[PDB]
Design a protein around this ligand. Structure first.
Ligand SMILES: CCCCCCCCCCCCCCCCCC(=O)OC[C@H](COP(=O)([O-])OCC(O)COP(=O)([O-])OC[C@@H](COC(=O)CCCCCCCCCCCCCCCCC)OC(=O)CCCCCCCCCCCCCCCCC)OC(=O)CCCCCCCCCCCCCCCCC
Ligand SMILES: CCCCCCCCCCCCCCCCCC(=O)OC[C@H](COP(=O)([O-])OCC(O)COP(=O)([O-])OC[C@@H](COC(=O)CCCCCCCCCCCCCCCCC)OC(=O)CCCCCCCCCCCCCCCCC)OC(=O)CCCCCCCCCCCCCCCCC
Ligand SMILES: CCCCCCCCCCCCCCCCCC(=O)OC[C@H](COP(=O)([O-])OCC[N+](C)(C)C)OC(=O)CCCCCCCCCCCCCCCCC
Ligand SMILES: CCCCCCCCCCCCCCCCCC(=O)OC[C@H](COP(=O)([O-])OCC[N+](C)(C)C)OC(=O)CCCCCCCCCCCCCCCCC
Ligand SMILES: CCCCCCCCCCCCCCCCCC(=O)OC[C@H](COP(=O)(O)OCCN)OC(=O)CCCCCCCCCCCCCCCCC
Ligand SMILES: CCCCCCCCCCCCCCCCCC(=O)OC[C@H](COP(=O)(O)OCCN)OC(=O)CCCCCCCCCCCCCCCCC
Ligand SMILES: CCCCCCCCCCCCO[C@@H]1O[C@H](CO)[C@@H](O[C@H]2O[C@H](CO)[C@@H](O)[C@H](O)[C@H]2O)[C@H](O)[C@H]1O
Ligand SMILES: CCCCCCCCCCCCO[C@@H]1O[C@H](CO)[C@@H](O[C@H]2O[C@H](CO)[C@@H](O)[C@H](O)[C@H]2O)[C@H](O)[C@H]1O
Ligand code: SF4
Lengths: 51, 70, 83, 95, 115, 174, 155, 318, 98, 114, 96
C-alpha cells in the first residue's frame, strides 16, 4: 500500500548484499621530524599512518 | 671510579630504610611497647573489643593479668 | 615411536616453550593420581577445626564417643604429628 | 523446572543454591535461617494456593527478618520521639 | 579511617604540588607557545581523528581472559575444602579450557595484528 | 556523618551513573563508569565483601581500558562532547543531579522518604548483624565453594567463555 | 631585610637553573657531531647536569648546531616558541653564528639571530667539543649573574 | 600518630625517588665509560635538588587544544596512586594491614594506567595519542599474565595478605620452588612500570616523548616522580614475593636492613637492564607475553594447584 | 527498605533510561549496558552479604563473567558496524526499514 | 504481637573474668581440659535451646569454673604464667610458635604442682 | 622444603584453632549476658521516651513467633552514642 512516507523505499538487493560504502577510511598524517631524535634533525618525513 | 656511585646509593638506602623503621617504632609507641594487634578475621576483632572493655581505660592494648582476678 | 620421537625433536627445536608448557601441564594432571601423599591433603583439611564441635547429649549408648577431650575415643592426629 | 531432569536422574545441578537454609560451607548459617526453615516446612507439599493463606504467619515473619521494615519503623518512631523530647528539655539520656 | 586518611593525604599532596607548579612560576602565554607539538611543523588534521586499532581482536579477548583470573583468584581458598577431588578437577578443567581458547585463537591467527 | 559512609558513597555512585548515562563522549562516559566502579567497590566492601568489591573494580578497570582504545578508533569525532558542550547532554545531566539531590535532601531531613516506594533513612548500619566472631571470612568461603559445590556453574561459565572466544572470531571476520 | 632575602633567593633559583640545563635534542648539520662528542665519555656533559631531552616542553636550552636554511627557519622558530621559560639559545658554529661558508647562499639564513635571540655565540667550523663545553659553561655563568628577584624587589 | 606515620612514608619515598634519579644517571654513566653527575654537589649529590627546584619554577604550559581538566587531573592521579601503592607494604609492618593486600595492588596498578591514557588523550596531540594507545596495548599484554603469576605464587603462601608472604618464606626464599615464575614476574614488572626494554609509552627515539610530550615543569615532574616511585615499589614487591626476609619481632630493624638491600639491588638491575638492551617493538611485546609467558604461566598455574595437593603441603588459610 | 537501596535502584533506573534513550554513538549505549550490570552487581552483593547467604556469595562473580561475554559481543558488533560505515552512529543502521 | 521477656539486670549479674585475650590464649589449652564439663554443658544448652535467655544459669557456671581455674594458677604458678602470656601479648598475631620456651616453664609448673 | 614447612604451618594453625574452641564457651556466655543487658537497658529507656504516646506498648515484638530472634545493630545500639555505634558496625571492617 504506497504512501507518502514510503515513497522513497526500494526493494532490497536480490542477494541481500548492499554495496560497500566509502565514507572516508582516511589515514593519519604525521610530521616525523625534523626536530625528532630519529630524524637526524633536518628530515621532515611526512608519513601516512593506519594505526 | 665506580665507588663514586655509592654515596647516592647510600642516601637512597637510608631514605628507603626510614618508612620501615618509622612504622615499627610508631606501632610500639602507640600500642604500649608491643606490636600493633592484627585483626584480619572477626574473631580477632572480637577479642580486641573485649580487651578494650576489660582494660578499664578503653585501650585494647592495655592488658590485665592475674592481678585482675580476686 | 619413530614418528613421535621425530615429532618431539622438531617441536623441541622450534617451540621449546610449548614443549615445556605441555610437559608441565601433563604432569599436573597425572601426578596427583600417582602420589601416595594426595590422601593426606584431604585428611588435613578435615582435621582443621573451623567450627565449634557441638557436644552430643549423652543418652547412655555411645561408647565410641568420649566424655572428655583427653579420652582415647575419637579421631587422633597422631598421623599428623608424624607426617 | 520445565523438564525436571535433575529429579529424574538424581543429580543436583543447582538446587544446592536455591535456598539459604540449604547446607552451607562449614555450616555457616544465614541470618534468617530459622524463619526460612519454618516457612518452608509449613508450606511443604500443600501447594502455593493453600500456602499463601495457610502459611501467611510464617511468611510475614520471614519477610520481616529479610527486610526488617517493621523493625525500622519501630526504631524510627522512637528516635523521632526522643528528639521531640530533647528540645523540650523533657528527657536526659543515661550515661 | 586510616585508609581514607592515607588516600586523602596522597592525592592532596599531589594536588598541592600541582597548585604550586602553576602559581609559583612566572608565566608568559602567547599563541605560538601553546600550539600543539609536532616536530616544528603545524599538525596535519586533528588528533581526535580515528586511530586504527590493529590488535582489536586481542583487546576483546583480553576481556574474556581477564574474567578468567577473577574465576581463578579464589583458588587458594578453594584448596582448603575437604572435597579436594572435586575442586582439583574443576580447577584444572577451567585452566585447560582457558588454554584451549588460547590455542584456538592462536591457530586461527587471532593473535596476529591486522594489516 | 561517618555512620553514613555507605549512603555518601551511594550518592557518588548515582552521580557517576548520571555522568555516563547522559552519554557525552565515551572518553568521559568511561570515566564516570570508573568513578561508579570505585565507590561501588567501597559500598560492597563496607558490607563485608572486600573480595567482591575489589574484583568488580578490577574487572571494570580492564573493561574501560579496552573501551578507551576502541573509542579513539571507532567512537571519536573532531570535537568530543563534555557535559557542558551539548544541551541534550547537559539537560540530561542536570535532570539526574536534581532528581538525586531532592531524593537525598528529603530522605536526610525526614530520616525517611518515598521515591515511588518507601525507603528508611535511618542509616544503613541499623540492619547489620550483631554476632560475628568466627575465625574466617564468610565471603571467601562462599566464593571458594564455586569449585566444590558449584561444579555445574564452573562448567557452564567455562564453556561460555570458550564459546565467547570462538564467537568473537566468527563475528569480526569478513 | 628584603634586600638580603631576595639576593639569596636569586642565588637559589639561579643555581638550580644553571645546574640543571636540559638542551633540546636538536641538531642541524656538521656541528651536531661535535655536540654528540660533548655528550660522549671524554667530556660527558651529563656530569654537569646537562641532559638532552627531545620534547621542547621539557627543554631549557636550544643549541643551534648547524646551518639554518630558509626552509627550516619556521620549524626552528616553532620549537623555540614552544619552549617554556626561562629559555636560552646557544648558537654553535659559523653557520648558525652568521651564515658561515654558505653566507651568500640563496637558501641560507645569515645567522640564527635573525630568527631567535641568542645568549652565547660559540665560534668554529665546527667548534671543538671542548669549545662547545666552554660555551655551555659560559652560559651557566651568565645565568649565575641573573638578578630577577633583585630587580623585582626594586620595581 | 597515624598522620606522622603517613608522613614518614611519603617524604622518604619522594626523597628516595629523587636520589634514584641520581643513582640511575651515575650507574648508566659508568656502564657507558663516563661518570655522570659529579659537579652539582659532591659526587653529584645535589643534582636531584637542582632538578626538582628547576622544574617547579619552570613555566608550565596548557596546550591550546588540550582538555584542561583531564590534563591537570592525570598527573595528580599518577603521583597520588604511586604513593598509594606503598601503604600495604610490610617493611616488616605495613602502614595499612589488608587481608587482600595483593589484590589491592592489582586494582591500584590498573587504575594508574588511566593517568597515562588520560594525560595522552587530554593533550590533544598526535605523539601523545600514539603514546597513550601504546599504553592500552602494553596493559593488554601483561596484566593477564601478571595476575596469574601472583596466583601461582600465592598457592604456596595461602592468602592474599602481604605479611603472610614473610611467614611463608621463613625457611627459604620462594625463588627456589618458583624461579620459573620469578623470571616471568620480573620481566612483567619491567613492562608494568614501562621500563626498558619495554619503555614504549614514552618511546623517546620513536615518539619524541610519547604520552607526556606536552607536559612541562611541575606537571611533568609528577609523571617522572610517579614513574620512579613505581620502579622502587615493584622491586620491593618482588623482594617480598620471592626473596623473603626473616622477621625477628623484637628487632624489626634487622628485617628492614636486609629487606632494603634486596630491594635496592633489584632496583639496580632495572638500571642495569636499561643500559644493556635495545627496545622491543610494541607488537613484539604483546606476542612475547601471549605466545610465550601465557602458555607457560597457564601450565605452571595448573602445576602449582596440583603440587600442594599431591605433596600434602597445602598452606594454612590463616 | 534501607536507604542504600534507594540509590542503587536509582542507579539502575538511570542507566536503563540512558540505555533506552539513544543518541548517536553506539559505544555510548554499550556503556549504559555495562553500567546496568554494575548496579545489578552491587545490589545483588549487598543483599547476599547482608543476609549472610554464604553460597550465594559466588553469583555476583558469575554475574560479572557473563557481563564480559555480553560486552565482548557488543564490541565485536561495534567493530563490524564501524568497518562498514566508518562511524559507530546508530542512525546508519536503518537499512531494514525496507 | 506480644512483648519480649527479658531477664532483670540482677538476673544477669555475675562475676566476670577480667583478663585480656592474651591471658585467655595462654591458658586456653589447659582451660579447655580443666573446665570441659560446665563448658560443654553450657554449649549443649545453647545449641539445644537456641535461646540466650534459657541458658543463663548454665552460663554462670562457666564463669564460676573459669574463676576457680584462674585462682588455682594464681596460687601455684602465678609467676611462670606471667612470663608466658606476657610473651604471647607482645605478638601482633599472638602466636604460640614465638613463645615455646616460656610455655614449657608454665607447662612443667602446672604439671608438677597441679 | 615448602612441603615440610607448610605441614608445620598446618599443625600450628590447628593448635591455634583449638585454643579458640577452648575459650568459646566463656566468650559465648559473656556475649549472651551483654546482649541481654543492652536490650534490657534499651527497653527501660523506651518506657520513658514512649510513655505518653497514644497506643504504644513498650517492648512489643514485631514478630508473631515467640522464638528468640538475634537483634540487629539498630535494635541493640539504637539509642547509644555514634562512636560506640560506629565501632560496633564498621570497626572491624575499618581496622587497618
Ligand atoms: C583533583 C581534581 C583534578 C582535576 C581538577 C579539574 C580542574 C582543573 C582546572 C581547570 O579546569 O583548568 C581551568 C578551567 C578553565 O579553563 P578554560 O580553557 O578557560 O575552559 C575550558 C572549558 O571549561 C572546558 O574544560 P574541560 O574540557 O576540561 O571540561 C570541564 C569538565 C566538564 O565538566 C562539566 O562539563 C560539568 C561537570 C562534570 C564533572 C563532574 C563529574 C562528572 C560525572 C562523574 C561523577 C563524579 C562525581 C564524584 O571536564 C571533565 O570532564 C572533568 C572531569 C573531572 C572528574 C574528576 C574525577 C571525579 O577551569 C576553571 O578554571 C573554571
Ligand atoms: C528516577 C528518575 C528516572 C531516571 C532518569 C533520571 C534522569 C537522569 C538521566 C538519565 C539519562 C537520560 C538520557 C538522555 C538521552 O541521552 O537522551 C538523548 C535524546 C536524543 O539525543 P540527541 O541524539 O542528541 O538528539 C537531540 C535532539 O532531540 C534531536 O533533534 P530533534 O530533531 O529530534 O529535535 C526535535 C525534537 C522535539 O521534540 C518534540 O517533538 C516535541 C514533543 C513534545 C511533546 C510534549 O524531537 C524529539 O526529540 C522527539 C523525541 C522526544 C522524546 C519523546 C517524548 C514523547 O535527547 C532527548 O531526546 C531529550 C532528552 C534530554 C532530557 C533527559 C531527561 C530524562 C528524563 C526521562 C524520563 C524519566 C522518567 C522517569
Ligand atoms: C632547598 C635547599 C637546597 C639548597 C642547595 C644550595 C646549593 C649549594 C650550592 O650553591 O653549591 C655550591 C655552589 C658552588 O659554586 P659554583 O656552582 O659556582 O661552582 C662552579 C663549578 N665548579 C666549582 C666546579 C667550578 O656555590 C654557589 O654557587 C653559590 C650559590 C649558593 C646557592 C644559594 C643558597 C641560598
Ligand atoms: C619536589 C618539590 C620541589 C618544590 C620546589 C619549590 C620551589 C622551591 C624554591 C623556591 C625559591 C623561590 C621561588 C621564586 C621563583 C619566582 C619565579 C620568578 O623568578 O619570577 C620572577 C618575577 C619577575 O617579576 P617582575 O615584575 O620583575 O618581571 C616580570 C614581568 N615581566 C614579564 C613583564 C617582565 O618575580 C616574581 O614573580 C616575584 C618574586 C617573588 C619571590 C617570592
Ligand atoms: C577516576 C579518578 C580516580 C582518581 C583516584 C581516586 C582515588 C581512588 C583510590 C582507590 C579507590 C578504591 C579504594 C579501595 C580500597 C580497598 C582496600 C581494602 O579493601 O582494604 C581496606 C579495608 C579492608 O580491610 P580488610 O583486611 O580487607 O578487611 C578488614 C579486616 N580488618 O577497608 C577499609 O579500610 C575501609 C575503607 C572504606 C572507604 C572506601 C572508600 C572508597 C572510595 C572510592 C573512591
Ligand atoms: C644475571 C644477573 C641478572 C640480574 C637480575 C636482578 C637480580 C638481582 C637480585 C637482587 C637480590 C639478590 C639477593 C641479595 C641478598 C641480600 C643479602 C642480605 O642482605 O641478607 C642476607 C640474606 C639471608 O637472610 P634472609 O633472606 O633473611 O634468610 C632467608 C630466610 N627467609 O642473604 C644471604 O645470603
Ligand atoms: C577440556 C576438558 C578438560 C577436562 C580435564 C579434567 C582433568 C582432571 C584430571 C583429574 C585431576 C584430579 O585427579 C584426582 O585428584 C584427587 C584429589 O585431588 C585424587 O584423590 C586422591 O586423594 C584424595 C584426597 O586427597 C582422596 O579422597 C582420594 O580417595 C584419592 O584417590 C585422585 O587420586 C586423582 O585421580
Ligand atoms: C594447559 C596449559 C598448557 C597448554 C598450552 C596452551 C597454549 C597452546 C598454544 C597453541 C599451540 C598450537 O597453536 C599454535 O599454532 C601455530 C600454527 O599457526 C603454530 O605455529 C605457528 O606459530 C609459531 C609461533 O607463532 C610460528 O613460529 C610458526 O611459524 C607458525 O607455524 C604454533 O607453534 C602453535 O603454538
Ligand atoms: S659551522 Fe662548519 S661544521 Fe658547523 S654546520 Fe656549518 S660548515 Fe658544518
Amino acid at each position: 500500500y504506497p504512501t507518502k512516507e514510503t515513497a522513497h523505499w526500494k526493494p532490497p538487493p536480490w542477494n541481500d548484499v548492499d554495496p560497500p560504502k566509502d565514507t572516508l577510511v582516511s589515514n593519519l598524517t604525521l610530521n616525523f621530524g625534523p626536530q625528532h631524535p630519529a630524524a637526524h634533525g633536518v628530515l621532515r618525513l611526512v608519513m601516512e599512518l593506519s594505526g | 671510579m665506580w665507588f663514586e656511585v655509592l654515596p647516592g646509593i647510600a642516601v637512597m638506602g637510608v631514605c628507603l630504610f626510614i618508612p620501615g623503621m618509622a612504622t615499627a617504632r610508631i606501632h610500639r609507641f602507640s600500642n604500649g611497647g608491643k606490636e600493633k594487634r592484627v585483626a584480619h578475621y572477626p574473631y580477632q576483632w572480637y577479642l580486641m573489643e573485649r580487651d578494650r572493655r576489660v582494660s578499664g581505660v578503653n585501650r585494647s592494648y592495655v592488658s590485665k593479668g592475674l592481678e585482675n582476678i580476686d | 615411536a619413530e614418528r613421535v620421537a621425530a615429532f618431539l625433536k622438531n617441536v623441541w627445536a622450534k617451540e621449546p616453550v610449548l614443549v615445556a608448557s605441555f610437559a608441565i601441564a601433563g604432569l599436573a594432571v597425572i601426578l596427583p593420581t600417582l602420589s601416595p601423599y594426595t590422601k593426606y591433603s584431604l585428611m588435613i583439611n578435615r582435621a582443621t577445626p573451623y567450627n565449634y564441635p557441638v557436644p552430643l547429649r549423652d543418652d547412655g549408648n555411645m561408647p565410641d564417643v568420649p566424655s572428655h577431650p583427653q579420652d582415647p575415643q575419637g579421631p587422633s592426629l597422631e598421623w599428623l604429628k608424624r607426617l | 523446572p520445565f523438564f525436571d531432569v535433575q529429579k529424574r536422574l538424581g543429580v543436583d545441578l543447582d538446587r544446592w543454591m536455591t535456598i539459604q537454609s540449604a547446607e552451607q560451607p562449614h555450616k555457616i548459617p544465614s541470618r534468617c535461617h530459622a524463619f526460612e526453615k519454618e516457612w518452608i516446612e509449613c508450606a511443604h507439599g500443600i501447594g502455593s494456593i493453600r500456602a499463601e493463606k495457610e502459611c501467611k504467619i510464617e511468611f510475614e515473619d520471614f519477610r520481616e527478618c529479610l527486610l526488617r521494615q517493621k523493625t525500622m519503623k519501630r526504631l524510627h518512631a522512637i528516635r523521632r520521639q526522643r528528639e521531640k523530647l530533647i528540645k523540650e528539655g523533657k528527657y536526659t539520656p543515661p550515661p | 579511617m586510616n585508609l581514607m586518611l592515607a588516600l586523602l593525604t596522597n592525592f592532596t599532596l599531589a594536588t598541592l604540588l600541582v597548585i604550586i607548579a602553576f602559581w609559583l612560576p612566572q608565566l608568559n602565554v602567547y599563541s605560538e607557545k601553546t600550539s600543539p607539538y609536532e616536530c616544528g611543523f603545524d599538525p596535519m588534521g586533528s588528533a581526535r581523528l580515528p586511530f586504527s586499532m590493529k590488535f582489536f581482536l586481542v583487546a576483546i579477548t583480553f576481556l574474556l581472559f581477564d574474567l578468567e583470573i577473577a574465576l581463578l583468584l579464589p583458588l587458594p581458598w578453594a584448596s582448603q575444602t575437604a572435597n579436594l577431588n572435586t575442586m582439583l578437577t574443576m580447577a584444572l578443567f577451567l585452566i585447560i579450557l582457558l588454554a584451549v581458547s588460547l590455542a584456538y585463537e592462536w591457530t586461527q591467527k587471532g593473535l596476529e595484528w591486522t594489516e | 556523618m561517618m555512620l553514613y559512609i555507605v549512603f555518601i558513597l551511594s550518592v557518588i555512585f548515582v552521580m557517576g551513573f548520571v555522568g555516563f548515562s547522559s552519554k557525552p563522549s565515551p572518553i568521559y562516559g568511561g570515566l564516570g563508569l570508573i568513578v561508579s566502579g570505585g565507590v561501588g567497590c567501597g559500598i560492597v566492601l563496607n558490607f563485608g565483601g572486600s573480595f567482591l568489591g575489589l574484583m568488580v573494580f578490577l574487572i571494570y578497570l580492564g573493561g574501560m581500558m579496552v573501551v578507551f582504545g576502541y573509542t579513539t578508533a571507532m567512537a571519536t569525532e573532531q570535537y568530543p562532547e563534555i557535559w557542558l558542550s551539548n544541551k541534550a547532554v547537559l539537560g540530561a545531566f542536570v535532570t539526574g543531579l536534581l532528581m538525586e539531590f531532592f531524593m537525598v535532601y528529603y530522605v536526610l531531613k525526614d530520616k525517611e522518604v518515598e521515591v515511588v516506594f518507601e525507603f528508611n533513612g535511618l542509616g544503613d548500619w541499623v540492619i547489620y548483624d550483631t554476632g560475628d566472631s568466627g575465625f574466617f571470612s564468610e565471603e571467601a568461603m562462599g566464593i571458594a565453594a564455586l569449585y566444590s559445590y558449584g561444579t555445574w556453574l564452573v562448567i557452564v561459565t567455562g564453556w561460555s567463555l570458550l564459546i565467547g572466544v570462538v564467537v568473537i572470531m566468527e563475528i569480526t571476520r569478513g | 631585610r628584603g634586600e638580603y632575602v631576595v639576593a639569596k633567593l636569586d642565588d637559589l633559583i639561579n643555581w638550580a637553573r644553571r645546574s640543571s640545563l636540559w638542551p633540546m635534542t636538536f641538531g642541524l648539520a656538521c656541528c651536531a657531531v661535535e655536540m654528540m662528542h660533548m655528550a660522549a665519555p671524554r667530556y660527558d656533559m651529563d656530569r654537569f647536569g646537562v641532559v638532552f631531552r627531545a620534547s621542547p616542553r621539557q627543554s631549557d636550552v636550544m643549541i643551534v648546531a648547524g646551518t639554518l636554511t630558509n626552509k627550516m627557519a619556521p620549524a626552528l622558530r616553532k620549537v623555540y616558541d614552544q619552549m617554556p621559560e626561562p629559555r636560552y639559545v646557544v648558537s654553535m658554529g659559523s653557520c648558525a653564528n652568521g651564515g658561515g661558508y654558505y653566507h651568500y647562499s640563496y637558501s641560507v639564513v645569515r645567522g640564527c639571530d635573525r630568527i631567535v635571540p641568542v645568549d652565547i655565540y660559540v665560534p668554529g667550523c665546527p667548534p671543538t667539543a671542548e669549545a662547545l663545553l666552554y660555551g655551555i659553561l659560559q652560559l651557566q655563568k651568565k645565568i649565575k649573574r641573573e638578578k630577577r628577584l633583585r630587580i623585582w624587589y626594586r620595581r | 600518630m597515624f598522620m606522622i606515620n603517613i608522613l614518614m612514608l611519603i617524604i622518604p619515598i619522594l626523597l628516595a625517588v629523587a636520589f634514584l634519579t641520581l643513582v640511575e644517571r651515575k650507574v648508566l654513566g659508568y656502564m657507558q665509560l663516563r661518570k655522570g653527575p659529579n659537579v652539582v654537589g659532591p659526587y653529584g649529590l645535589l643534582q636531584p635538588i637542582a632538578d626538582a627546584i628547576k622544574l617547579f619554577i619552570k613555566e608550565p604550559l596548557r596546550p591550546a587544544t588540550s582538555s584542561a581538566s583531564m590534563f591537570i587531573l592525570a598527573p595528580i592521579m599518577a603521583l597520588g596512586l604511586a604513593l598509594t601503592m606503598w601503604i600495604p607494604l610490610p617493611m616488616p609492618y605495613p602502614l595499612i594491614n589488608m587481608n587482600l593486600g595483593v589484590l589491592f595492588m592489582l586494582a591500584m596498578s590498573s587504575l594508574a594506567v588511566y593517568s597515562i591514557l588520560w594525560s595522552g588523550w587530554a593533550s590533544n596531540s598526535k605523539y601523545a595519542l600514539i603514546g597513550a594507545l601504546r599504553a592500552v596495548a602494553q596493559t593488554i599484554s601483561y596484566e593477564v599474565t601478571l595476575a596469574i603469576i601472583l596466583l601461582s605464587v600465592l598457592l604456596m603462601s595461602g592468602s592474599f595478605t602481604l605479611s603472610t608472604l614473610i611467614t611463608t618464606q621463613e625457611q627459604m626464599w620462594l625463588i627456589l620452588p618458583a624461579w620459573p615464575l620469578a623470571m616471568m614476574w620480573f620481566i612483567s614488572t619491567l613492562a608494568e612500570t614501562n621500563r626498558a626494554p619495554f619503555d614504549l609509552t614514552e618511546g623517546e627515539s620513536e615518539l619524541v616523548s610519547g604520552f607526556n610530550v606536552e607536559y612541562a615543569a611541575g606537571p611533568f615532574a609528577l609523571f617522572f616522580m610517579a614513574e620512579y616511585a613505581n620502579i622502587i615499589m615493584m622491586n620491593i614487591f618482588t623482594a617480598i614475593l620471592f626473596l623473603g626476609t626473616s622477621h625477628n619481632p623484637h628487632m624489626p630493624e634487622l628485617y628492614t636492613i636486609n629487606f632494603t638491600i634486596k630491594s635496592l639491588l633489584l632496583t639496580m638491575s632495572f638500571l642495569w637492564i636499561r643500559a644493556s638492551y635495545p627496545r622491543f617493538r610494541y607488537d613484539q611485546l604483546m606476542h612475547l607475553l601471549w605466545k610465550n609467558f601465557l602458555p607457560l604461566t597457564l601450565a605452571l598455574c595448573m602445576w602449582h594447584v596440583s603440587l600442594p595437593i599431591l605433596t600434602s603441603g597445602i598452606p594454612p588459610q590463616t | 527498605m534501607s536507604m542504600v537501596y534507594m540509590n542503587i535502584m536509582m542507579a539502575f533506573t538511570v542507566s536503563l533510561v540512558g540505555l533506552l534513550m539513544y543518541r548517536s554513538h553506539l559505544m555510548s549505549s554499550l556503556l549504559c549496558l555495562e553500567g546496568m550490570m554494575l548496579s545489578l552487581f552491587v545490589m545483588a552483593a549487598l543483599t547476599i552479604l547482608n543476609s549472610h547467604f554464604t553460597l550465594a556469595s559466588m553469583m555476583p562473580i558469575i554475574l560479572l563473567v557473563f557481563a564480559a561475554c555480553e560486552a565482548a559481543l557488543g564490541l565485536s558488533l561495534l567493530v563490524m558496524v564501524s568497518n562498514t560505515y566508518g562511524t559507530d552512529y546508530v542512525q546508519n543502521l536503518n537499512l531494514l526499514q525496507c | 504481637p506480644g512483648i519480649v521477656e527479658l531477664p532483670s539486670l540482677e538476673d544477669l549479674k555475675v562475676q566476670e573474668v577480667k583478663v585480656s585475650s592474651s591471658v585467655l590464649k595462654a591458658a586456653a589449652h589447659h582451660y579447655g581440659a580443666q573446665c570441659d564439663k560446665p563448658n560443654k554443658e553450657f554449649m549443649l544448652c545453647r545449641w539445644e535451646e537456641k535461646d540466650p535467655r534459657r541458658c543463663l544459669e548454665e552460663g554462670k557456671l562457666v564463669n564460676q569454673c573459669a574463676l576457680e581455674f584462674f585462682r588455682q594458677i594464681k596460687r601455684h604458678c602465678a609467676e611462670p604464667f606471667t612470663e608466658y602470656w606476657t610473651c604471647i601479648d607482645y605478638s601482633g598475631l599472638q602466636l604460640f610458635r614465638r613463645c615455646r620456651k616460656q610455655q614449657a616453664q608454665f607447662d612443667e609448673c602446672v604439671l608438677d604442682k597441679l | 622444603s615448602m612441603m615440610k614447612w607448610n605441614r608445620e604451618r598446618r599443625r600450628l594453625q590447628i593448635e591455634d584453632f583449638e585454643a579458640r574452641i577452648a575459650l568459646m564457651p566463656l566468650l559465648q556466655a559473656e556475649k549472651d549476658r551483654r546482649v541481654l543487658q543492652m536490650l534490657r537497658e534499651n527497653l527501660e529507656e523506651e518506657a520513658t521516651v514512649m510513655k505518653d504516646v497514644p497506643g504504644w506498648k513498650v517492648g512489643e515484638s514485631v514478630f508473631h513467633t515467640t522464638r528468640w530472634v538475634t537483634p540487629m545493630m539498630g535494635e541493640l545500639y539504637g539509642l547509644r552514642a555514634s562512636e560506640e555505634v560506629l565501632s560496633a558496625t564498621y570497626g572491624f571492617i575499618w581496622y587497618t
